[PDB]
Design a protein around this ligand. Sequence first.
Ligand SMILES: CS(=O)(=O)N1CCc2c(c(-c3ccc(C(F)(F)F)cc3)nn2C[C@@H](O)CN2CCC(c3c[nH]c4cc[n+](O)cc34)CC2)C1
Length: 221
Amino acid sequence: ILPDSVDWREKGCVTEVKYQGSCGASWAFSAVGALEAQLKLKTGKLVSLSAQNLVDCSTEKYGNKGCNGGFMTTAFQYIIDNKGIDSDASYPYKAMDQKCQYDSKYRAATCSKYTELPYGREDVLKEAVANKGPVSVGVDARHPSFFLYRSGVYYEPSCTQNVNHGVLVVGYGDLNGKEYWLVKNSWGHNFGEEGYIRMARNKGNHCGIASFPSYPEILQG
Ligand SMILES: CS(=O)(=O)N1CCc2c(c(-c3ccc(C(F)(F)F)cc3)nn2C[C@@H](O)CN2CCC(c3c[nH]c4cc[n+](O)cc34)CC2)C1
């Protein structure tokens, strides 16, 4: 039996909204956001993890291009392969491609595996958000309505199921009858509701929110 509403901010699993700047690294912010929540569930400690570490180190082997884009799934694979990711404090974000400076001395999290959810399945996404944690997703963000969004439940008739911007689903609910996904963006506090957007849910995979969902886990064995 799934809750009607969830908000992982209430469970202490969501760090401050970040500002990616002119670097196209939303993939890296989406990935660290998902892992931040799993780290809190494991250790009780909420700590921002290094998006820069992913930008600089999860590169050609993972199909990622730093400030020119990339993928959450392969970001997670880098963290698995590397046996760690640094804290954001120890390896801060500069919004540029830099030489990899990963140092195991400042490791703040590990990742054992990741899971991809099936294309377009908002019911499966709901279950994962309720029972696993925040889920990294792609959205179609290429409409003025998206970047100008201030409040309410976002619905854009021209949205497609093709995704181009990485964000984090941290919850869901309903606002005066409109079902929504609660989405953490990485465009700082002047986007949306202090950095968050509520996006239409159960409206035929609106803006591709359920097209490419994935989440990491931190496990023994
Ligand atoms: C137009 S579309 O929207 O239909 N779409 C098409 C399909 C798609 C999209 C995203 C998608 C797009 C954007 C985002 C976001 F913006 F959020 F960041 C998220 C997901 N994923 N896939 C699934 C895989 O094709 C992604 N896969 C392909 C292999 C590739 C790769 C190259 N070298 C490697 C070395 C090692 N490994 O392991 C993998 C590779 C990267 C991983 C976009």
